[PDB]
């Protein structure tokens, strides 16, 4: 009781309800693009889909996944105005759901969305979908339906180290550590993408439907002459009878997901994260409150403790150094029953939040107990005597412990994101397990009105050195371009159809989905953490 | 003696002669193409550094390294006709060398290329260098001299995992597992480029010259009217004797660099690797020879042993598997003394030749003896009985020992490196140490001219389908720009501007490269291999 | 070169002069005191021990070590002004020498000093000499010649968890880490003594003249009656023979030595601990010149580089953080071809000493380098600014990291060492391997001037308060016994006599007892180090 965070927030004011139309409108936006996104190819693509008497992909994933079972869909929007064309999704749908009780990686590819084929952003979300089942330890289900590759764009599907090659080197290497790989084939499966069911351990393959080949009929054709079919190529019947290349023979695709449940039963799986739990309890306050508590202008101050009370259990919160380093609020609460140390900006970092950030960092690291990051976060203070103060070696702590803390991280983009205080938050070169962002925030190495006001300050010099000097809407013209790339790329369209994050949410869902993800976490055991020389 | 190579290739043939014109057209294009990348921004700009009293950073490279030692640069066409403009090897010069006896990772900004700013493929070159520096186990010294980031492009610099984070995420993890960090700033230092120096174990710092600031001058003038110079706000007086941000405070570059390597004199140093060496041996013939060996047609088939018997200690190799599955050569040798096992294209790859490899990395592997792949590769035979034979679960066998093998990987692309094949030979998604390629290779996820063939095979059809035919011209200018699109997508410049490969290099330095390597390798232990499960 | 420490000091000057006079006087009254020491209970007590046949005890160590072995011996000043009677050495000595090539800790009773009976001190010296043998892992040979205890004492030598009954839970919890554990019975060896030999692995005791036994011929007669020898209750031949407490029968101390050197020569021993190490070098100025460096005021600075310039190879030192927290000097060296780190006091501790202090001890642990503390300290800076600034936290993270280093420290007192500031520099309860002390050194809670300032600045308020002053005598005279209190109770002679420390030493003899207690320290294994929370 002593530890209740008490609002000061009334969801009756002015203010209140202006903060909520703002967010709203950007909420409302982002429901109405999701609904489009789940539309895949759109209506007659879908049509053409289900007229061969396939199910569509998230019809898929519904029976897959166990009755009720929540779906943590992660990067609805990748590839969102990338193209030339609508590639809804990437073209994959993928997710954490239980199956047969265990929360398994699903990774399904969208035929309707250009047959399935691999863009550049697809095969980044098939790794990513990867690297997160490896960092949690997550059994993971590949619905295979996919026409091959984006040709025009082959230097950046192929070669590289992060490119198509790389699935199957996590296939192995997640195998090699105990972590299932299953693979329902329930379509097109051609050239390297062969390797798909071939380096899972148990491949399900659709009868009369599913195809796998390492080099297609039109190629056989080209190379020796020969005149097959894809089915009589690699068809069902082949590769479960005759080759091997697949393990279990279904007569359609939902005979094929029971089977894929019967694969997953027989895993013999067990979660081997712990946490010390608590009963979970609700938050105080409404989540749907949240919408009003984020100011409707993103550089006006708010109590972030505000947000903090609609997202933790009982809206309990025991704070650490409360009356030090005030622009960065640390403290511990529990999620849906599972501890959480929560680190979050409250203004402009100074020396003393970043030493505090890296102390309570290290109590999180030695406890064992996850980390949650809520970034706000515009820079760091500047002038001479903050750099002779040692800034940059005090944010250089709380980056180091960033770094090396090896318990489970999430962090939530709640407002800015720029600069090296990106970093110290536990940004995506951070590793934490899931990055999410919220609607309102922002993105980029510095905010789009510092940009402009360098072009601007020294395109004044340059008049000045010439005896003239910029009017106002001669400097406003100057900044508009420079304005306008930085909105463009911070948007959270932007940085989600790119995978900068695993999603932009709706901040009421917040809770929801971080509870979805400690539960994910700890299917990998916590681990103790090393740190590196810290620069005292 | 019974293992000896005994060549059947004559220097002085007409063949030899045409094959030797065609590799050396391109070797001489590749020399003199180093030897432009060499002046970095070029005379004037090199002229301007230089009368600052600075030492341009191959001087700076030169200087640091003990007397004689060679050098293994990395990546030097980094950027290669990427950018609008030159930005010579991406404004950075890297690779190992030996300092005070200790193999390090040397990392140094070229402040003559853009004022040494980083654009995308600086970041990468960056991370990089640190990915071979923990992956080998190599302390690491960055010369710093950099004046920001390529802002126009800054969604491509800052904010994703292989973004300019996780430079600082790479020195606390390499400083946690005892692999050090060394910073020597001796230029510009601004912004989140702070924490290179904040975030290294041991920083040195030039006076009057080198400077630190999370903020600039500029912007403390925008944001406080505070008026400061860069040299009061952040130079080496003020952080070497007030902030501690820096440990050594240098007199000038000559004098930071003979700091830098007392440093590494005191590191207490030892390596890790282990492997039963023999006193070295050179080839039976010539390396130059290697410019007569591969023939002048790419897709003319050769004896790979060719190539082995220029590379390998005494030209011996004992080859295992001999008479199965003859289009993959696989054997063991010794190259400067060390065990390497070798797999090398000779041929398309057939479901035995990938049996084959897989049972070769097997014993490599128990061993714990260094692989290298020298890669040649079309693809897989194609047809019914080679699908129904089950050639997709025996190229996964390969994909499997290739991806799970611990031992030190090397790989080298001496002629083609298309589709699947690509990943079964130990691409860059397989995570060799170091990947090289030579200069008549080409790269792709599939030949041009089997792209090609498939926008013809197929307008061809849409003639017929039109009671037309498609003339010879016609045919001609449709497969025009798929051909030009491949051979210009896969051209060693292109690889290697984008670094999906560590240097397009001279064929008759490979066997000095891959010793350099090797050696290199060693300061990391030996480690044991898991294989996931094979698909048998 | 560069790293050469250039000598301001003239040997030739008033001042050095000055210094040296003020230092000989020390040094030659502690060789005096050494001399007398070495005599044991004294000229009759030695002729008595002689005439049974009997060597005496540092000749039995001379014959024991291999010839010219240089041995380390410890706290030679035991006991010295405690008892009401001399106590030389407190009846034991003990040090480590090599033995067949081993460096062995070799404790032996001297049975003309009171017998050999156990005082407080006796027992405390015991067990040092074991701590030091379980941390450096060096095989313990115990000279056995002792006649019990000192019972008007028997409080503070049996019943503790650091009394006489801890000497067997070494000797077991050793043999079961594999330290041998080689007990030579020379003279008597009774009640609770049996112990020594009996659980000792191996045994040797010398007949008609070695005895052992649980109860003596005394008690024996008491309790049953029974009239016994002690030969014939105990001697070589019941045990030898008979009893199996003993395994080696001796002819005489000469045989029963050759016997203990047989048994070292089969330990089958190998030391465990690396380093990489250079050609040795002397220090380019003579070790005598120490006694001219430390000004004869203990008050009055002076460059302590000037004590690490006769003391490392080629007086040569790489400054760490040269310009910051200048009052802490850090560095690397090489002593006797050693990597060493050395931290050493230079003036007050101020809050950027401690911090570059713990810096640079997170850099000797990173690379397994041992460390090298020279203290001469009299506490932090003291007022409101410096408690705001935190110094209290900044001292805790160098105290941090001293407590949780795990490479071997090893610490000299060259001046004062008081206070906090003791703790900060590796003092007595943070467990260096071995800590030293010069003769010219004082430790204390605080210095005597600052206790002494307590008394009289609080008796003139006393005076004030009733309308008087006191005056220049008076308050000499309530300072005197505190600063006698000071003086007395800080000497080196009270420290040692108390095994506050493990020798007085010439100063000149620094670099030889470091060195052999870094090959001592190696028998054992470096270990990596876990630091505990640092209070940022």
């Given at each position: 009781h002593m530890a209740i965070l008490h609002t000061?927030?009334?969801?009756?004011?002015a203010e209140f309800a202006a903060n909520a139309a703002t967010m709203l409108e950007q909420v409302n936006a982002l429901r109405t693009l999701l609904g489009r996104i789940h539309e895949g190819g759109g209506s007659a693509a879908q049509a053409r889909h289900s007229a061969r008497g396939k199910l569509l992909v998230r019809e898929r994933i519904n029976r897959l996944l166990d009755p009720g079972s929540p779906f943590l869909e992660?990067?609805?929007?990748?590839?969102?105005?990338?193209?030339?064309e609508e590639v809804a999704a990437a073209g994959i749908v993928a997710g954490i759901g239980r199956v047969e009780g265990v929360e398994c990686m699903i990774v399904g590819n969208d035929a309707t969305v250009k047959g399935g084929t691999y863009y550049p952003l697809t095969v980044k979300k098939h790794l990513r979908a990867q690297a997160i089942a490896l960092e949690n330890r997550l059994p993971c289900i590949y619905l295979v339906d996919s026409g091959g590759a984006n040709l025009p764009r082959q230097d950046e599907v192929f070669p590289?180290?992060?490119?198509?090659?790389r699935i199957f080197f996590n296939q192995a290497n997640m195998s090699a550590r105990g972590i299932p790989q299953i693979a329902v084939v329930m379509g097109s499966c051609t050239a390297?993408?062969?390797?798909?069911p071939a380096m899972s351990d148990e491949t399900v393959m659709v009868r009369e439907q599913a195809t796998i080949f390492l080099a297609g009929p039109p190629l056989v054709k080209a190379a020796t002459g020969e005149v097959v079919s894809a089915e009589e190529l690699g068809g069902a019947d082949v590769h479960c009878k005759?080759?091997?290349?697949?393990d279990h023979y279904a007569e359609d695709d939902d005979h094929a997901l029971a089977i894929a449940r019967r694969c997953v039963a027989n895993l013999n799986w067990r979660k081997q994260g712990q946490l010390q739990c608590r009963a979970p309890r609700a938050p105080?306050?409404?989540?749907?409150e949240l919408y009003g508590v984020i100011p409707a202008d993103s550089k006006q101050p708010y109590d972030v403790r505000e947000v903090i009370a609609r997202l933790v259990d009982g809206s309990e919160f025991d704070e650490f150094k409360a009356l030090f380093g005030t622009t960065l609020v640390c403290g511990f609460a529990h999620l849906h029953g599972y501890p959480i140390a929560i680190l979050a900006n409250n203004g402009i970092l100074f020396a003393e939040a970043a030493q505090k950030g890296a102390h309570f960092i290290e109590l999180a690291c030695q406890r064992g107990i996850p980390l949650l990051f809520l970034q706000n976060i515009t820079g760091f203070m500047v002038g001479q005597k903050y750099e002779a103060g040692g800034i940059a070696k005090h944010g250089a702590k709380l980056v180091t412990a960033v770094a090396c803390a090896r318990v489970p991280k999430f962090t939530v983009l709640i407002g800015g994101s720029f600069g090296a205080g990106n970093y110290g938050m536990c940004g995506r070169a951070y590793d934490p397990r899931f990055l999410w962002m919220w609607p309102n925030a922002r993105i980029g190495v510095m905010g789009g009105e510092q940009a402009a006001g360098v072009l601007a300050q020294v395109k004044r010099e340059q008049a000045e050195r010439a005896g003239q000097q910029l009017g106002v809407e001669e400097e406003a013209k100057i900044k508009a371009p420079i304005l306008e790339q930085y909105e463009h790329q911070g948007h959270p369209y932007y940085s989600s159809a790119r995978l900068w994050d695993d999603g932009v949410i709706d901040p009421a869902q917040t809770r929801e989905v971080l509870a979805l993800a400690l539960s994910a976490a700890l299917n990998a055991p916590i681990e103790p953490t090393a740190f590196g020389v810290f620069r005292m």
């Open positions: 000061q927030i009334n969801p009756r004011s992660l990067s609805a929007l990748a590839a969102h105005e990338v193209y030339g590289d180290r992060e490119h198509f090659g390297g993408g062969a390797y798909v005759v080759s091997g290349v697949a105080l306050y409404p989540a749907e």
